[PDB]
Design a protein around this ligand. Structure first.
Ligand SMILES: Cc1cn([C@H]2C[C@H](O)[C@@H](COP(=O)(O)OP(=O)(O)OP(=O)(O)O)O2)c(=O)[nH]c1=O
Ligand SMILES: Cc1cn([C@H]2C[C@H](O)[C@@H](COP(=O)(O)OP(=O)(O)OP(=O)(O)O)O2)c(=O)[nH]c1=O
Ligand SMILES: [Mg+2]
Ligand SMILES: [Mg+2]
Lengths: 679, 679
């Protein structure tokens, strides 16, 4: 109001980092930070036009907005939607969300001096982009985004509608075959993807080990390390461009591989089948097989056969060279490297395939260990031309904010919109630099819908993370989300007359995918959990519904080969105002090293001085509770979930190992990095 | 003979490293080394068949000889040629030649225990391979090789005719364009070429400098170093696979570039135009121009415009960003790096283009600085597919042994055979992994005929290296070789009805190429030199001949775009028994660190205790005499000559620089490495 003092937003934000003699925080100060930000910074540097109409005009004229996007609608519908947007009542809930959106997400004039968009403008453009002319779908997307229910991945949210636009997808998984063409391509792909800001993970399990033959002459191959060396250099050059490599635990270079991190910027990931755990239990030895022999004798690559199921067969075939290391020592090295670097990530091959409803095996994952899909080899001509374009994996993501989803009765529309939005991201993608990525996305329409703010919700509702109530909720919540997503995908296939490639061989086709849901235990184990769904008007899918969907799926099929995937939510979290994963908060007042002050503080959603006790941080909760929560969700998520375990700095490799053992026994499909308290 | 002692060939070889109280060597001991080698080793482990016929049979049956080669002739002609071969009277002249041929060049049984070929068998197979069914040409090749007059490059000599065969060409030059596709391809090429043992050189002058824009955003590019880093790693992986990079002296990263060697295994090469020398003379500054601007404003890449001719224009255009360093300090850094590492190589751009008879500019050279040809850009699709296949350079080599050439009157047949042989190497090449190399070789038919044993000859004839007699001879000898090579190429074009691509724009077409030869100074300046040609029956081409060839060339054209190129002769030298280049011997008894004894000693050809004074080593002769000799040859060789300068270990960078200045003023097209005495 008229003449007011104190307008230093950072100072105000910083008050969040103060405790009073009773251990309380002045949460109000953040809000005052917001207000001061808008008054001293946002408003003064934002561009206001005489009307929406003249703005679009100008924005398209000076090369900011892409007229092609706007051209798919009657301009009037366009003006009406922006108006509906700015009428929604949207407010940033935290000083960091606001600042984060203005400093990194919103459109600025090319000289960088002024803003040209506000939150609702960006949402609007995203809705127009994804809706592709479908007015009713564009309004919904708008609504879902403004209400906080849906939040598309950073790369989509940022580029949609812009003239000078990045890619809408930024995370890829490529396989490498055991021949020089496939290697040269991989380095090329790294290069063309990295320059476009993509996260790229590479499978190494098919490469022949150090010492294997080449053209029949003995002891000649160099193994994976030198290829890692090349992929590493490509990622450094093209820059924001990060890499990963996955290697099967029973591959001959496994220890040399792990030893690179004892190569500086590549992330490592290990695939571990069940047999490896059995071996370590009985203090046995691990047999490592040569991909070179496996190819010659079995006619498929290392990364395409099933090690566990053929373990003994392989050890018996004298035509397959075997090498041996100490299983228990393997896990020991693993925990020690993880203790220091956070990775290697771990992908439980047997758990994954056993749960995989798609014909084929899953031999790798991504830079965040949440993506798990099938892939297939590409073959090349000597000039590097593709003679057979296989299928690799690009990964289209977005996430719902659990609290807001529960706060809206029409949960079926909430999910269906998101699925329709991600599906669009897939439909509009054509990654030209790497045909196997373009073929794959086009054949599978695979998408990854995820969740966030679970902790935020459970706290708001007075439930403690990890508790029997919590576990009950996360099981039934993922239960219902799954029902509506599969339904939406079925509708898409029906309204489009096509299904994902190879649907017929899926467990969706035969019906086996539903067995799980046809048995019981979908009755709320807890009384509070029954109360939450009821007070929200959400109906937990009943056996009839599943039985009905089974028939629809079997008859019409589904459009997307994969629907869910739960990554960590990076900085979109601050915008959407959600607690990052489905995992507990890493802190009450998360501190970030950003901006002209050095730090910006972020309070957890729905947290106040009267409910602090519900915000025990991830360290305090510990691994068990976290693993348990993820276990409940893993029973439904058809892909994976980035799972990080937070440990005190006195934890030991045995502690780490015991956690991983528990994760494994519990059904967890994958583990992201193990993190130790250090600030 | 019946019961003889002393059969240790190495011990006998080693006697060459002994001086008697009068400073004389027992050269006879080497011969005894040969004899003992044959008796104790070669004969006992060689496979003898009941007949030639059964041998071919077996060799083709067990997968050693390629029946496709033999199939181009009546088997009888085949048996007759092997017989003519073994009847020639061929003898190894030195213990190293023999051992070198048996341990590294001849065909062995796959288990490595026995030899399956002798010198004449390998020569025969090479003649059959290159002759391609032409019986008369196969006999000649056989004769030329057995007499010592011709010696094909190692890669050809070694693989021809073999079933399990390497490439016949192993040296390539590729250009890189200023875009990510072209970079990815380059790394790919490195990989596919290196695995096949090729030497690959890359042009970097077109890449935009560190700090240049990308997509209009300022300060973004990383320059050449990170690309060097990638090419370096590719060469380490694919292994025997060596690399080089060339950079224009006036490129903005010139000092960062040089600074990598102050990157461990890549060779460096610098292109230096005349202006740079003028600047250093007047202690001026060097202007470095940005390839990014040059492209935008001139529409061609840095490496395609003429810096010297546009120096001032460029400095004046305010649309071209300029950077500045101290010319004299540049040469200083150069000499200091050369002092320690031998390179950078140096290619005198202006000298080269001025002498280039082919339409286009020459912007790079090879790993040995003897190759100088034109090239052109390739353009790519985003999937890396070629949309326009440009022209890169592969390099087909072989060399004549001057002494033996002079020892045969029909010098016209000697040259014509060699040209026909190299041309075949070109005709049979199809490097599939890199289309620009295949296109180029197919469009130009470029070959590189070279010379060796010059010092061996001059010594035999009692002429001192560097002397006025010597200079007279090397000028007229290269004069005549040139006449017959151009003649042969003209005949080829005539008998094949086609010329090199772009002949019409060449100086061969207009006739300007001959002007040089139409004026005088082809009269032997020395009386001995007149005597040598006469005593050999070789007629120095007369103006009539040139005048006649001019008409023939202008009317029928020539087949090959380039004919001569004088590289250093590696180990083929020991086989052919020639003094390596056209440069003086590096030693009287060259010592090599090879074999079970650690060393093998090699005496120079035609050297005895009564003519030692004619074998002053390269150090003793010094740079001037060497440069001078090369100057005489450079006036005729249409490509280049690897020129190494040998210095005492007390030489200074000023000494090095003064040499390079003299080379430059003298016409030298290029300089290989500067070597300092160190053993
Ligand atoms: C050439 C070469 C290959 N390799 C490895 C890379 C690949 O994993 C593997 C296959 O290379 P490829 O190019 O498939 O080998 P090839 O087909 O020539 O030989 P083969 O017929 O035996 O397969 O060889 C090296 O490690 N170093 C090398 O120098
Ligand atoms: C992407 C990228 C390019 N480069 C360099 C490599 C090439 O020499 C040069 C050209 O890359 P290009 O892929 O041609 O650049 P572009 O076409 O996207 O941008 P422009 O339109 O400006 O040309 O950019 C880097 O140094 N680092 C990078 O991350
Ligand atoms: Mg192979
Ligand atoms: Mg470009």
């Amino acid at each position: 109001r008229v003449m007011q003092e104190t307008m230093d937003y950072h100072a105000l934000n910083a008050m969040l980092n103060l405790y009073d003699k009773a251990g309380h925080i002045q949460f109000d100060k953040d809000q005052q930070a917001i207000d001061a930000f808008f008054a001293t910074h946002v408003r003064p540097h934002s561009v206001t036009f005489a009307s929406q109409h003249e703005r679009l005009g100008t924005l398209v004229r000076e090369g900011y907005y892409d007229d092609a996007v706007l051209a798919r609608y009657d301009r009037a519908f366009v003006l009406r939607l922006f108006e509906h947007a700015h009428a929604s009542g949207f407010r940033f809930q935290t000083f960091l969300g606001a600042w984060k959106f203005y400093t990194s997400y919103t459109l600025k004039t090319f000289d960088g001096k002024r803003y040209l968009e506000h939150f609702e403008d960006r949402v609007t453009m995203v809705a127009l982009t994804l809706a592709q002319g479908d007015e009713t779908l564009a309004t919904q997307l708008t609504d879902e985004m403004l209400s906080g229910r849906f939040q598309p991945a950073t790369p989509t949210f940022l580029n949609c509608g812009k003239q000078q636009r990045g890619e809408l997808v930024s995370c890829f998984l490529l396989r490498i075959e055991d021949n020089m063409e496939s290697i040269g391509r991989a380095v090329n792909s790294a290069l063309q993807l990295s320059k476009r800001g993509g996260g790229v993970a590479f499978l190494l399990s098919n490469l022949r080990e150090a010492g294997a033959p080449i053209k029949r002459i003995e002891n000649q191959s160099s193994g994976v390390i030198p290829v890692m060396k090349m992929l590493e250099d490509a990622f450094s050059y093209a820059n924001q461009g990060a890499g990963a490599v996955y290697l099967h635990a029973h591959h001959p270079d496994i220890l040399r591989f792990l030893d690179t991190k004892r190569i500086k910027t590549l992330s490592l990931g290990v695939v571990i089948p069940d047999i490896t755990f059995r071996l370590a239990k009985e203090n046995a030895q691990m047999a490592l097989f040569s991909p070179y022999d496996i190819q010659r004798r079995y006619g498929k690559p290392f990364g395409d056969i099933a090690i566990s199921e053929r373990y003994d067969e392989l050890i018996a075939d004298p035509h397959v060279r075997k090498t041996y290391i100490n299983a228990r020592d393997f896990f020991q090295t693993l925990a020690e490297i993880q203790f220091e670097s956070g990775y290697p990530y771990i992908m439980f091959e047997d758990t994954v395939n056993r749960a995989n409803p798609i014909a084929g095996r899953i031999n790798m994952s991504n830079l965040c260990s949440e993506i798990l899909q099938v892939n297939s080899a590409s073959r090349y001509d000597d000039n590097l031309d593709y003679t057979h374009i296989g299928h690799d994996i690009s990964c289209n993501l977005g996430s719902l904010n659990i609290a807001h989803v529960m706060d809206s009765p029409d949960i079926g529309r909430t999910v269906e919109t998101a699925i329709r939005g991600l599906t669009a991201v897939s439909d509009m993608s054509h990654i030209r630099s790497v045909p196997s990525i373009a073929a794959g996305n086009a054949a599978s329409h695979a998408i990854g819908l995820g969740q966030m703010n679970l902790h935020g919700y459970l706290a708001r509702e007075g439930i403690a993370y990890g508790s029997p109530e919590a576990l009950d909720f996360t099981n039934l919540y993922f239960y219902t989300i799954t029902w509506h997503a599969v339904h939406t995908s079925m509708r898409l296939a029906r309204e489009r007359g096509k299904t994902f490639a190879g649907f017929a061989q899926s467990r969706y086709a035969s019906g086996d995918y539903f067995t799980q849901y046809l048995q019981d235990d979908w009755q709320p184990k807890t009384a509070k959990v029954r109360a939450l769904f009821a007070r929200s008007g959400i109906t937990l899918p009943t056996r009839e519904m599943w039985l009905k969907l089974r028939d629809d799926v079997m008859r019409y099929g589904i459009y997307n080969q994969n629907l869910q995937a739960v990554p960590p939510t990076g900085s979109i979290s601050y915008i959407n105002h959600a607690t990052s994963s489905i995992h507990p908060i890493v802190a009450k007042i998360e501190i970030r090293k950003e901006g002209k002050t050095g730090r910006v503080y972020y309070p957890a959603p729905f947290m106040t001085n009267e409910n602090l006790d519900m915000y025990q941080d991830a360290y305090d909760i510990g691994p068990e509770k976290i693993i348990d929560t993820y276990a409940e969700a893993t029973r439904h998520v058809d892909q994976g979930l980035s799972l990080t375990l937070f440990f005190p700095d006195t934890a030991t490799t045995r502690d780490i190992n015991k956690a991983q053992i528990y994760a494994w026994r519990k059904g967890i499909k994958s583990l992201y990095y193990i993190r130790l308290r250090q600030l």
